[PDB]
């Protein structure tokens, strides 16, 4: 069951703290990705082209970067994914994937990046990701209702709270 694997992946990401060393990202990538894995990210078509394609040595460095932003929380929500079987591997095509990060201590913004995630997994004991393609449609940012109460009467501070803190 592929769906268990992305649950286990979200579960591992819970153990991340500022206190974790760079080699934690390697052990994480070894548990969930193949040694020859490939990872593609296609960014919002409201911007220019933008398209990561990276192999295994850079995958630890990719995930680390998600928490360089101020993100202290990361999980992937898969609504109605299609599992298909083939000779060497299983595909998981999820048209309704949301990448959720929460910024700040305390939380001051949640970022939802919605797109299609396609995974191929090795069909062996380990069930590790051969291929990762996330083509993003859109991103929205949510802020606590409390922050709006606070700055009701501050046109300038409301003008700044209006602005996205990420690009996608």
């Amino acid at each position: 069951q592929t769906d268990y694997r992305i649950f286990e992946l979200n579960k591992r990401l819970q153990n991340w703290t500022e206190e974790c060393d760079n080699l934690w990202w390697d052990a994480f990538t070894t548990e969930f990705f193949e040694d020859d894995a490939m990872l593609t990210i296609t960014f919002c078509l409201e911007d220019g082209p933008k398209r990561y394609t990276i192999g295994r040595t850079l995958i630890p460095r990719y995930f680390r970067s998600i928490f360089e932003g101020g993100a202290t929380e990361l999980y992937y929500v898969l609504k109605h994914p299609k599992e298909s079987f083939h000779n060497n591997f299983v595909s998981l095509d999820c048209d309704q994937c949301t990448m959720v990060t929460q910024h700040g201590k305390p939380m001051f913004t949640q970022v939802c990046v919605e797109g299609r995630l396609y995974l191929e997994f090795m069909f062996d004991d380990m069930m590790r990701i051969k291929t990762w393609h996330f083509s993003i449609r859109q991103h929205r940012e949510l802020i606590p209702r409390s922050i709006l109460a606070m700055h009701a009467q501050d046109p300038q501070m409301l003008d700044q709270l209006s602005k996205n803190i990420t690009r996608c």
Binding site: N22, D26, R51, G55, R56, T57, L58
Partner: protein
């Protein structure tokens, strides 16, 4: 073996005093785990400069490559460790070493976005034209990861 492991552990946790006790108790400085990581790989990833220097001094292989073909200089460059990049080049680390993906240190530094690390690699004769498995150059990677300073530089060579 037994000592082999404790020395990977200590090299990881940047435990300077515990690297000395082990080296004095005969720990193999070219000891490797299932990945093919050496103390040097580990210390170079977690930024432990003093352990890098002392391993290199007791015969640690500067150019040891893990199962994915990855060298300490690859790792220092990717994780943005200036002083460790300098020390490794001086101990003879291969500046144009290729992993399984066709990544060079320059590719990885082009990604990480460390301005000086790129120039030190270029000074030490990094290939500006090196193509990874996907036909991408350090230049390309710096556009991809939005490091436009680094790409200005790479447009020169």
């Amino acid at each position: 073996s037994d000592l082999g492991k404790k020395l990977l552990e200590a090299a990881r946790a940047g435990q300077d005093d515990e690297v000395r006790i082990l080296m004095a108790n005969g720990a193999d400085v070219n000891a490797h785990d299932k990945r093919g990581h050496t103390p040097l790989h580990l210390a170079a990833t977690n930024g432990h400069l003093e352990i890098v220097e002392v391993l290199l001094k007791t015969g640690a292989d500067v150019n040891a490559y893990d199962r994915t073909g990855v060298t300490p200089l690859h790792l220092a460059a990717m994780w943005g460790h200036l002083e460790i990049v300098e020390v490794l080049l001086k101990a003879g680390a291969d500046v144009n070493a290729l992993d399984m993906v066709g990544y060079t240190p320059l590719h990885l530094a082009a990604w990480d976005g460390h301005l000086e690390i790129v120039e030190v690699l270029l000074k030490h004769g990094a290939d500006v034209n090196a193509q990874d498995k996907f036909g991408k150059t350090p230049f390309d990677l710096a556009i991809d990861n939005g490091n436009e300073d680094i790409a200005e530089v790479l447009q020169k060579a």
